[PDB]
Design a protein around this ligand. Structure first.
Ligand SMILES: *C\C=C(C)/C=C/C=C(C)/C=C/C1=C(C)CCCC1(C)C
Ligand SMILES: CCCCCCCC/C=C\CCCCCCCC(=O)O
Ligand SMILES: CCCCCCCC/C=C\CCCCCCCC(=O)O
Ligand SMILES: CCCCCCCC/C=C\CCCCCCCC(=O)O
Ligand SMILES: CCCCCCCC/C=C\CCCCCCCC(=O)O
Ligand SMILES: CCCCCCCC/C=C\CCCCCCCC(=O)O
Ligand SMILES: [Cl-]
Ligand SMILES: [Cl-]
Length: 264
């Protein structure tokens, strides 16, 4: 149902996608280890945000590692190309993790914005229905990424709207609660907002590969645009979300965070 099943791959194409996903496993699980160790230097009120990235990291992780195994399961070298065998590959399982990866990030962004209580829970509930929104219409479109490209843009169209709509929430929150933010991180938080519009725009581009490049190199590009969007919303966004909590933790008087920052 997917363009990936349409082609045979040269060995270079196939080894490259495999090294991509594998390098992408190496990284979520090695970011995973950093996010563990620095969690002791984060104040009790921010510490779930570091932890949440421990989850992001295992979750893109598993599916990423899972895509790499299914890649080598699905294809074998026959007569000079890698050809599809008995099992399929697909990015279908990538959109389900998006289901889980985002609320969590959205959650760690909300946590360091210093949202609390009813605004925090409320804004989490809306944010989560919205991207969940964006995510599932994404899902249903790529379903027709071979049979019915009209549903790709049309479902593309729909999921985009949600993406616009949700950025609006996040941005409003971010620029509203800049002034609560301690240690200089009111400057930093606007940067993440920006970074975050890059990694998540890689996605629609990654989602129009069949419309505009329905061949084997588009399959590869699509995965390439997957590893960076991936590394950026999960790993770099993550890295960047960690620094604000430690900074704000030292600003609020958390001596392990002070000591950690002063050590560097
Ligand atoms: C792990 C984190 C993220 C932020 C993955 C995000 C996916 C998107 C921002 C993609 C949205 C869609 C667009 C708007 C285009 C139509 C189909 C998609 C779901 C890929
Ligand atoms: C922030 C960085 C994102 C991660 C970078 C992803 C990995 C960079 C990979 C190398 C790009 C150039 C390789 C060109 C290979 C040609 C593909 C082919 O063999 O057919
Ligand atoms: C089998 C995996 C192959 C790739 C080798 C793994 C090594 C990856 C190296 C760095 C991971 C990228 C993230 C950087 C670590 C973040 C911690 C820090 O801020 O210093
Ligand atoms: C692979 C990792 C093995 C060790 C796990 C990292 C130990 C973290 C120490 C800690 O901060 O509590
Ligand atoms: C909430 C559901 C939002 C409205 C989406 C309606 C348009 C998507 C329909 C595509 C189905 C079709 O093309 O037959
Ligand atoms: C050239 C490549 C671009 C740089 C990539 C760097 C990776 C992540 C940087 C880590 C996040 C920085 C935290 C905030 C920095 C600060 O305000 O001091
Ligand atoms: Cl605290
Ligand atoms: Cl994912």
């Amino acid at each position: 149902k997917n363009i990936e099943s349409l082609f045979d791959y040269s060995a270079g194409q196939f080894e490259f996608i495999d090294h991509l996903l594998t390098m992408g496993v190496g990284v979520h699980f090695a970011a995973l280890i950093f996010f563990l160790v620095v969690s002791q230097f984060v104040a009790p009120k921010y510490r779930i945000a570091t932890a949440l990235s421990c989850i992001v990291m295992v979750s893109a992780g598993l599916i990423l590692n899972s895509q790499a195994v299914m890649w080598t399961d699905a294809y074998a070298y026959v007569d000079g190309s890698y050809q599809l065998q008995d099992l399929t590959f697909s990015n279908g399982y990538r959109y389900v993790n998006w289901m889980a990866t985002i609320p969590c990030l959205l959650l760690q962004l909300l946590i360091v914005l210093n949202l609390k209580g009813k605004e925090l829970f409320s804004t989490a509930t809306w944010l989560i229905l919205a991207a969940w929104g964006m995510i599932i219409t994404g899902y249903v479109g790529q379903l027709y990424e071979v049979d019915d490209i009209a549903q790709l843009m049309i479902w593309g169209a729909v999921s985009t709207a949600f993406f616009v709509v949700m950025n609006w929430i996040v941005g409003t929150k971010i620029f509203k609660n800049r002034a609560t933010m301690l240690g200089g991180t009111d400057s930093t938080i606007t940067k993440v907002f920006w970074l975050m519009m890059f990694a998540w725009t890689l996605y629609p581009i990654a989602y129009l590969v069949p419309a505009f490049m329905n061949n084997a190199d588009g399959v590869v590009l699509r995965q390439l645009l997957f590893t960076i969007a991936d590394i950026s919303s999960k790993v770099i966004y993550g890295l960047m979300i960690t620094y604000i909590a430690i900074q704000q933790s030292a600003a609020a008087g958390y001596v392990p965070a002070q000591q950690a920052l002063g050590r560097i």
